[PDB]
Symmetry: D2
Subunit: 249 residues, 4 copies
């Protein structure tokens, strides 16, 4: 019987590449999305064309709210409903934008940035564990958490909280044989809205090849961590950053 995986924010970019590579490795996949319905379904169609009834989609807002716990339980439930099991959770979905300390409401920014990057991963982790082989969770972290971008304090707080969850959950779920690890990109796929001149500025800072990581290169580290080659690995965060985090000002 084929294992099954949930990937949050899987319709595009890094999450899409993760879903594709898990599917290629033999997983059935839940493609979670928020706004990207068309791209989510398009991906599921591609995967189901390769192997029938191996991909489903699942819609949810992961902003923090009174309903978030129910939404996260339903994401996990969607995997059990479609595939009868849930072996892997990848927490990939993430809101990302500046929140300057000195001059959406700030309460909404808190809900979106801390909800997507930290609280929803926590609630999904709870629901994943409650419903339980090579079981594991992979959190998409950020190699630059300790050298943060100016005016991104709430985003950064969210990613730091995710490191804490990764470590806390590794410890607490180890007795259940659930491993919990992270993958920490530096510069990967740049924002669609960023101008080419700015993209090049960031690319040229990367020591290894002066370019961003492809989505597939991020996905490769995820595949490693969920594999039998990582069966003793828990609580670990692998940087996939081409040396960027080691570069001084």
């Amino acid at each position: 019987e084929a294992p099954a995986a949930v990937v949050t924010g899987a319709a595009k970019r890094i999450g899409r590449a993760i879903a594709v590579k898990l599917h290629q490795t033999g997983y059935r996949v839940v493609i979670h999305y928020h706004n990207s319905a068309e791209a989510a379904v398009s991906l599921a169609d591609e995967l189901n064309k390769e192997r029938s009834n191996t991909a489903v989609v699942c819609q949810a807002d992961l902003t923090n709210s009174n309903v978030l716990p129910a939404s996260c339980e339903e994401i996990i439930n969607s995997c059990f409903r479609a595939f009868g099991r849930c072996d892997v959770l990848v927490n990939n979905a993430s809101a990302f934008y500046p929140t300057p300390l000195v001059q959406k409401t700030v309460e909404t920014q808190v809900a979106e940035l801390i909800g997507t990057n930290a609280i929803a991963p926590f609630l999904l982790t709870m629901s994943f564990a409650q419903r339980q082989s090579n079981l594991s969770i992979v959190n998409l972290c950020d190699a630059m958490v300790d050298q943060p971008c100016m005016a991104f304090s709430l985003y950064n707080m969210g990613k730091h909280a995710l490191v804490g969850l990764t470590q806390s959950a590794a410890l607490e779920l180890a007795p259940y044989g659930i491993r919990v690890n992270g993958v920490a990109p530096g510069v990967s796929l740049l924002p669609v809205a960023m101008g080419e001149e700015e993209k090049d500025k960031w690319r040229r800072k990367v020591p290894l090849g002066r370019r961003e990581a492809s989505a597939e290169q991020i996905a490769d580290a995820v595949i490693f961590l969920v594999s039998g080659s990582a069966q003793y690995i828990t609580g670990s965060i692998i940087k996939v950053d081409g040396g960027l985090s080691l570069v001084h000002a």
Copy 2:
């Protein structure tokens, strides 16, 4: 004219020792409290008896909510109203209790209290402190054991990790304004009032330096250092005051 400081959760325990030591150093203090009204007022009375018009209390819930930004703004405003200035912010108030991943507060409430008090309220207080602006600084009460967490304390731990992030992010962003942002990270300090002596001794005996918990005063000493002129080039730093506990393997 005397500088002024806000200390959150200052009615008791470590926050009280911090407020007392800042007061002894010449600061006027806002004693923030949530439920500990009697202890807060009693402390302000003691400090004002020592020097008139040098302490006020300020009540606020720092649970996450849509009104938390306004509450945090009002804490800072309370310092300006009492003293005409706000030089130092100490983020000390903190909810602390287990939230097991596997099995009667709702999880919505646990998130709001643990992430609100330990991370979001510090962020909003930091915003308000900075907006309203000399030796200006913020000191966050962190946790030396954030990377060796207590079993079943994931939300608390997430909160303290987020506070590290804030410490670093805010140091960077507020450096141009001359505001320093640092942390003090206890290991074992004052044990919970409800904990039995047998358990207290179990944790005390794990500490390499002296096999005892830190006094509240020892924590406060590190805060006093970081707000002083002796730390004027220090920002983004988190000083462990843990007697070596974080270095001890399983």
Copy 3:
């Protein structure tokens, strides 16, 4: 056509498992050894029986001395002599024993062996590897417990900390040459042959994930990942393979 790898201290235990797994992946291997001549030759025989002309041995003391640079150059040279190329360096060889700060090897010798094997020899091998230059990479065997050190192992610990520094420094400096530099950091893996069973069990039961030590093969798996095309964007990274041990408080 086949790439080639040097593995230091490869005659036994973790280094042997690394050499075997690299060989199984298609590498030709130099089996470096110091005292374990019989085991090194036996391993080369086993690998060459599987595929002819794919393994040689190379003897060297990696204690620090004025001749260590020449010895390390000769290890790399041995790879070029046997295989015409050198694609991968695994710095595995390591002296490990206590050096109490407060009280028949001299301290001069303890320094030379512990700092030589764990740090200086890796540095010199890295220099020689780089000078003599595709998927080129170095993997250093680090230690997940470097910040929760064993009592009385200060020189060993200093050595492993230095190796972290080298991993990061060399990643940065060799990135323009397309050489990646990464580490694998065990917690409890293969226990010392000389350790009593009662002590072995004490350490095993501290590991959160499965209450057992890592097999040599599990360590090797992380090395195989880091040298593979699946890690082509990874440099300066140290992967813990410790079953959660480093996260456990005292």
Copy 4:
């Protein structure tokens, strides 16, 4: 009776400021030096003019060698011989220069100097310090805030500073039962090299978030004073960055 401190490399720059501030705090001081005899003696004369019989000098090469253990024992011994006690050790002396991985000191000499001064000599001094105790005893190691964002081609220097972090932590743990605390102070940009042109100095200064300037030697010394004080009696194994936020700045 006044406590006593050893400060290595104390004739100039940061070590000098540390020795001065310890002296001002009431310590008697051993001023260790290697080549800077005239500056060491000049400092001792200034301190003894302030308070008689409160400063001596002690000469030693801290390069790694067969004699280094004996040299480090003798440094500690010189404190006991002058002052009858040794309360504080500050490991400050440090060689600093590039050692590129890819291309007239030999590399074995570079190893001996960079690893000796930054790591091995601190270890041996720590051993000797602890052996002679066998009251507020503490060691402060001068570390480096930028150890995880290293300067290109400074691999041996960086290895040395990483080793010193290890020592700080290992020694804190092992000496805690004796009541000896072990901590570090980690500068970012402090006193720039004497040779450096103002244009290059300003390049590095302008990277510092807090004030766009290097730390004074006195600012570094202030952190040392804190760590040896009664205000840090529960602090051990801690490394305080004094870097104006530099270590938090991305590329």
